[PDB]
Design a protein around this ligand. Sequence first.
Ligand SMILES: CCCCCCCC/C=C\CCCCCCCC(=O)OC[C@@H](O)CO
Ligand SMILES: CCCCCCCC/C=C\CCCCCCCC(=O)OC[C@@H](O)CO
Ligand SMILES: CCCCCCCC/C=C\CCCCCCCC(=O)OC[C@@H](O)CO
Ligand SMILES: CCCCCCCC/C=C\CCCCCCCC(=O)OC[C@@H](O)CO
Ligand SMILES: CCCCCCCC/C=C\CCCCCCCC(=O)OC[C@@H](O)CO
Ligand SMILES: CCCCCCCC/C=C\CCCCCCCC(=O)OC[C@@H](O)CO
Ligand SMILES: CCCCCCCC/C=C\CCCCCCCC(=O)OC[C@@H](O)CO
Ligand SMILES: CCCCCCCC/C=C\CCCCCCCC(=O)OC[C@H](O)CO
Ligand SMILES: CCCCCCCC/C=C\CCCCCCCC(=O)OC[C@H](O)CO
Ligand SMILES: CCCCCCCC/C=C\CCCCCCCC(=O)OC[C@H](O)CO
Ligand SMILES: *C/C=C(C)/C=C/C=C(C)/C=C/C1=C(C)CCCC1(C)C
Ligand SMILES: *C/C=C(C)/C=C/C=C(C)/C=C/C1=C(C)CCCC1(C)C
Ligand SMILES: *C/C=C(C)/C=C/C=C(C)/C=C/C1=C(C)CCCC1(C)C
Lengths: 228, 228, 228
Amino acid sequence: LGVEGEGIWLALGTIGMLLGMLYFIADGLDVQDPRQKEFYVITILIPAIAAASYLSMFFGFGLTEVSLANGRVVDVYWARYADWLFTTPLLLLDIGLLAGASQRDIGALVGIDAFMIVTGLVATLTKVVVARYAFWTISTISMVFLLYYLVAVFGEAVSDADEDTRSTFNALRNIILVTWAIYPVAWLVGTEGLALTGLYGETLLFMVLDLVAKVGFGFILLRSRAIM
Amino acid sequence: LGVEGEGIWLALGTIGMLLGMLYFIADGLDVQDPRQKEFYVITILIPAIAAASYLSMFFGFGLTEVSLANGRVVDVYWARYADWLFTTPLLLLDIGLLAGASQRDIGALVGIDAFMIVTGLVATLTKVVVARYAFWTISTISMVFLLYYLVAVFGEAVSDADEDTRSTFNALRNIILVTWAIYPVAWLVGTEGLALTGLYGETLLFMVLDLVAKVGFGFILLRSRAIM
Amino acid sequence: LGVEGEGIWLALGTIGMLLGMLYFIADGLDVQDPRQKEFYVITILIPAIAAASYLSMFFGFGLTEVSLANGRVVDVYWARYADWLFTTPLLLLDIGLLAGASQRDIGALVGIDAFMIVTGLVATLTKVVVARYAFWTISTISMVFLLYYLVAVFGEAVSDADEDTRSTFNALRNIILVTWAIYPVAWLVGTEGLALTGLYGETLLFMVLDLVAKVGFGFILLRSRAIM
Ligand SMILES: CCCCCCCC/C=C\CCCCCCCC(=O)OC[C@@H](O)CO
Ligand SMILES: CCCCCCCC/C=C\CCCCCCCC(=O)OC[C@@H](O)CO
Ligand SMILES: CCCCCCCC/C=C\CCCCCCCC(=O)OC[C@@H](O)CO
Ligand SMILES: CCCCCCCC/C=C\CCCCCCCC(=O)OC[C@@H](O)CO
Ligand SMILES: CCCCCCCC/C=C\CCCCCCCC(=O)OC[C@@H](O)CO
Ligand SMILES: CCCCCCCC/C=C\CCCCCCCC(=O)OC[C@@H](O)CO
Ligand SMILES: CCCCCCCC/C=C\CCCCCCCC(=O)OC[C@@H](O)CO
Ligand SMILES: CCCCCCCC/C=C\CCCCCCCC(=O)OC[C@H](O)CO
Ligand SMILES: CCCCCCCC/C=C\CCCCCCCC(=O)OC[C@H](O)CO
Ligand SMILES: CCCCCCCC/C=C\CCCCCCCC(=O)OC[C@H](O)CO
Ligand SMILES: *C/C=C(C)/C=C/C=C(C)/C=C/C1=C(C)CCCC1(C)C
Ligand SMILES: *C/C=C(C)/C=C/C=C(C)/C=C/C1=C(C)CCCC1(C)C
Ligand SMILES: *C/C=C(C)/C=C/C=C(C)/C=C/C1=C(C)CCCC1(C)C
């Protein structure tokens, strides 16, 4: 149920993540090759983690209240950030391995990703209004950098690969660009920021984004000839 | 000492870990070879972390009350999980390096292990009784998988090694299989779950399990010809 | 602001870290080589993390009160530890990469570093006074070992390198030795320990130490011929 009806999206999110996970598992049963197997392992682990995170939220674990200096009280699902701290580096690993990026480049993006998620958690938890928006601005700046780097650095890495790999990379890159860019906007319009929509709407929006970014992304990756 | 006499097991456990650590250190003083030396470092770090966790719990810092949604109050040593989050992947690294497993395979197992421990911690901290059991179930399923994968995947990797190595692997594998499998049982029968035993018994059980899984395991590993 | 005027050192620390970060970014713009580039990425990420930590503290989010069994109430800037938990391994990685230390050796020091930071956080947060000093002692022991291993192990790794690299390594090593050894002394003399100085003096001291250990260190590294 949740605080303001948002439990329905928490439940549907749990289910959607679980089904993606099982589909991926079903799909990888015959995989023998180590590189290919690796893509399965990372891509199954992603919605496992998101499914468990969603379920914990559905049950109200991982839900806090933050009282701002405003007097405003904000209903903060902080378990999302726990989810994000691990699933976003894994997503970056997934596409970096696809791109054939070096270990040092993947590590650089993982470092900037972690920075983005943690500064976003500070934005979400801080009581001081100006600090909320300062950290949201820090985190978004880091996001813009991360995305530019994904395009330029992973794009360069993938440029000497075969056409199947370049086309799959471009698809996955565009999923990241479009869906990841919406998260900070969603934070800003939802209850953590300007409150233009309430918790129910914000929770719906993240559920859709997460599902696209994990199960949609995973679907496109795992069905590609590029990983075989 | 402690809430209901259980501090004695916290103290013995501290001392035990510390003793195992010191012995391990004393044992590796003349080791020059980097691979052999790596086994020492990992196997010394494990009881260090566990000794420090045990000491924190003995002094009460590793201990919190969790009030359930039915009114039951549960006395929770959450420091265990802090310990487990790091020591279980290090133990898996140890035996994986023994087995000659690939980087990919150790990483996969470590991902599943981390998943297991974190969903365990959720099981332990959540206020809703059905959630407690749901997460204990998710974590136990992950464990069964981890243990299956340890046997099939690390066993396959070690199958091409020399006889001493396979023998030491089999001994260490069986220590993991038997001792790790008892932990979900301990949780279920202890105060976190069905409360068949109290805090004193439950603490004794985890002390014995941890000592076997860390110092017993470490002893068997570091004395083998396989690592020299 | 802050508890007792110490926000001025939080503000100057923020600004100091940010300006170091910016300098380093501006300094790395033309870098083509992957190894040189990696040194820039690490050394930019360090003061970015420290600037975000300092700003969070400046706004009051990286601060909590702790009531000791003493009755004494300590104003704890816990976000320092979050910072240190990531920045001290990255510093070790930086110098390790400079030393040409093996992956094993770097991982071993990062292990012991993490142990040192975590046990220091336990020291800072525990209410039982004897426990606070016991953990401070454990953490300091780990630090002395870490510093020794830095000198012996990383010094041996760098002993076959060219003169510029050896000379840069010795400068950076000496920065670590003097500055890092002072942190436990600040904790001891500051409000967490003997309270010989109040929060304002202690905050000032950590600001100075952090700026030398991150921006001073970074400056010396990134201007060296060794990394080119
Ligand atoms: C309602 C939340 C449910 C969350 C998931 C619970 C069940 C899963 C529990 C643990 C799994 C964690 C991730 C485990 C990831 C396993 C990946 C694997 O080994 O697959 C190999 C492929 O080739 C197979 O096709
Ligand atoms: C939620 C955070 C969980 C962190 C778990 C602790 C992480 C640190 C402890 C162990 C990490 C080891 C697993 C990381 C993967 C190590 C694989 C490896 O070392 O391969 C060696 C040779 O086979 C090839 O050169
Ligand atoms: C309330 C949140 C509940 C969910 C928390 C999730 C905790 C994190 C779980 C899993 C983290 C997995 C980290 C481990 C990820 C391993 C990635 C891997 O397979 O690397 C392969 C390389 O070594 C070789 O190419
Ligand atoms: C005011 C609080 C502090 C806010 C700092 C926010 C900084 C966010 C921007 C980036 C995140 C830091 C991680 C940045 C790590 C990558 C930097 C890089 O690749 O530089 C290229 C080199 O060649 C140098 O030119
Ligand atoms: C009270 C709780 C205290 C918890 C403190 C946790 C500190 C330990 C954290 C991480 C330890 C793992 C880091 C060190 C893990 C070993 C690194 C290594 O040897 O890797 C490469 C090789 O495998 C290549 O063959
Ligand atoms: C509750 C948290 C307890 C502490 C866990 C944190 C442990 C440290 C976490 C992140 C450290 C990242 C810094 C960088 C870690 C570098 C890992 C490494 O061994 O690389 C060596 C190779 O590059 C050599 O060629
Ligand atoms: C009142 C307490 C004050 C703080 C006490 C602890 C502060 C740290 C003290 C000393 C830090 C450095 C000690 C360890 C660093 C020296 C190790 C060394 O010299 O090795 C040389 C060999 O490798 C040559 O081949
Ligand atoms: C408020 C506190 C916020 C704290 C948030 C901390 C987030 C970052 C932590 C660890 C990232 C470590 C990532 C490892 C960095 C390696 C970078 C690298 O190897 O780059 C090579 C370069 O790209 C090519 O030459
Ligand atoms: C009572 C609580 C005690 C808690 C712990 C007390 C302090 C332990 C010191 C460092 C932590 C462990 C770090 C170990 C790092 C590896 C050390 C090593 O390299 O040992 C080599 C071995 O002898 C083969 O040569
Ligand atoms: C109440 C219950 C609480 C939880 C109890 C959990 C017990 C799990 C222990 C062992 C099963 C998993 C490990 C063994 C499963 C695989 C055995 C096997 O046949 O592996 C053969 C291998 O594939 C040949 O190469
Ligand atoms: C599977 C989950 C995904 C891919 C989530 C990605 C999340 C982000 C890109 C988060 C972005 C944020 C900002 C850049 C500003 C601060 C608010 C955040 C954390 C929502
Ligand atoms: C050194 C510590 C060791 C080897 C501890 C291992 C711990 C586990 C195998 C924990 C298992 C659990 C379950 C599978 C269900 C949920 C409760 C746990 C975390 C106790
Ligand atoms: C950039 C930040 C740096 C380099 C911080 C270093 C911090 C330490 C060396 C910490 C030392 C501590 C002890 C050894 C005893 C416990 C108190 C600590 C955590 C301050």
